Ligand SMILES: *[C@@H]1O[C@H](CO[C@@H]2O[C@@H](C)[C@@H](O)[C@@H](O)[C@@H]2O)[C@@H](O[C@@H]2O[C@H](CO)[C@@H](O)[C@H](O)[C@H]2NC(C)=O)[C@H](O)[C@H]1NC(C)=O
Ligand SMILES: *[C@@H]1O[C@H](CO)[C@@H](O[C@@H]2O[C@H](CO)[C@@H](O)[C@H](O)[C@H]2NC(C)=O)[C@H](O)[C@H]1NC(C)=O
Ligand SMILES: *[C@@H]1O[C@H](CO)[C@@H](O[C@@H]2O[C@H](CO)[C@@H](O)[C@H](O)[C@H]2NC(C)=O)[C@H](O)[C@H]1NC(C)=O
Ligand SMILES: *[C@@H]1O[C@H](CO)[C@@H](O)[C@H](O)[C@H]1NC(C)=O
């Protein structure tokens with residue numbers, strides 16, 4: 557037979573996920589530690605170095621080290637997802653629309669300059685707007701500016717919806733049959749006073765339903781990406797990450813389409829968390845991966861924070877089932893002491909937890925293990941939750957119940973049931 561595609565001589569696809577870069581262009585080592593970074597809001601940086609400080613957002617040197625690590629890692633990857641939050645945590649009057657656009661431009665061009673051939677799928681974060689959190693339900697300067705910045709990666713239809721509402725879907729050029737849906741979940745975030753009481757802000761739910769329907773009929777698989785996740789904040793009691801009304805509506809769509817959705821990937825929490833979306837009777841439907849931040853920032857009172865992280869997913873080519881996740885990190889104290897970075901493997905999920913893959917069943921069974929008393933699996937998970945920032949951090953019985961309940965129960969009814977039974 558002539559002119560047949562050439563067969564291979566077990567291939568695995570891979571993609572990167574980076575999030576919550578939070579560049580602080582003010583960062584510099586100075587004798588007066590209240591002047592190291594505007595993101596410390598006048599507190600003395602604790603022990604600052606070239607790669608940052610726990611009381612500061614990311615120096616450019618830290619962000620560049622993360623992307624240089626990716627570039628030089630020897631990992632092949634066919635795309636990258638980037639789930640938002642580029643400007644630093646400074647007060648509203650210290651920023652502006654133009655300043656926000658300048659920072660997002662810097663990060664976008666850093667990526668485009670270092671990875672000219674790599675398609676990247678961004679999502680907007682709640683800090684990717686001026687004033688922060690107030691992302692609107694109609695077009696805006698920011699939405700237009702990111703549409704221009706991200707045009708190398710996005711087709712006409714995606715640019716159109718991004719300009720209008722901050723969301724889009726896009727085919728993955730290197731992966732026929734895979735579509736990325738990039739939601740603007742900041743429309744559902746509590747502090748957003750521009751969307752209070754709207755049943756379908758920016759018509760994103762209607763759009764999402766229609767997009768998933770078309771993916772079904774076009775035999776596509778979907779990865780969902782967004783900044784703010786669904787479900788419950790695992791360190792708090794009964795505090796959904798987005799407003800309850802919206803969390804419930806979004807989860808209803810995700811459950812119904814859970815056979816088309818092969819992955820969900822979020823940021824915002826600056827922590828390494830898992831969730832398993834199940835139906836009301838506890839049949840696992842969809843795996844959810846919240847990635848930790850590059851920035852190590854924390855407030856003055858907060859007891860723990862994260863080390864900087866970036867992560868890589870492995871998936872089945874042409875099928876898009878998730879096979880593994882490799883979490884990398886920077887030991888910030890180690891890097892700052894010597895002045896050179898050593899981005900390094902934190903863990904491989906299948907090896908760390910002795911699971912076969914990232915399918916909902918495999919993670920659902922793992923979390924049953926977490927729940928057993930003195931589970932070594934949960935102890936490891938809690939260490940990884942802060943990206944190995946503090947091995948002596950402990951999670952008492954109340955803390956663990958809040959964590960496990962949030963991992964397994966993404967809707968209000970299931971979550972409440974879990975707390976009533978175990979708290
Ligand atoms: C769900 O999608 C089907 C399929 O529609 C087509 O296939 C998609 C992959 C995409 O290419 C769409 O643009 C296509 O229209 C919808 O069924 C079609 O609906 C149109 C009217 O809008 C009708 O003229 C066609 O005959 C329908 N085709 C079939 C096979 O039924 C369907 O309406 C969508 N459902 C919902 C609830 O949105
Ligand atoms: C993004 O911003 C950084 C600095 O905020 C720019 O970097 C300057 O030059 C080198 C590398 O180009 C940095 O290490 C320095 O920190 C920066 N200079 C000064 C005086 O601080 C970088 O060029 C910007 N990138 C883009 C694409 O705009
Ligand atoms: C990151 O690097 C720091 C500094 O090297 C490590 O700090 C060690 O912390 C343990 C307690 O957790 C101490 O007993 C050691 O003496 C410290 N080592 C040094 C050389 O100071 C820290 O453990 C590292 N983080 C990880 C996850 O390995
Ligand atoms: C910062 O640290 C120095 C100690 O070297 C101290 O004199 C100064 O008052 C501190 N400022 C604040 C706000 O903690």
Ligand SMILES: *[C@@H]1O[C@H](CO)[C@@H](O)[C@H](O)[C@H]1NC(C)=O
Nearest residue numbers: 752753754755756799801802
């Ligand atoms: C809007 O407010 C009313 C009453 O305050 C409430 O019944 C309704 O569910 C709210 N809608 C949304 C989308 O929050």
Ligand SMILES: [Zn+2]
Nearest residue numbers: 576578641824
């Ligand atoms: Zn953030």
Ligand SMILES: [Zn+2]
Nearest residue numbers: 641681682824
């Ligand atoms: Zn955020």
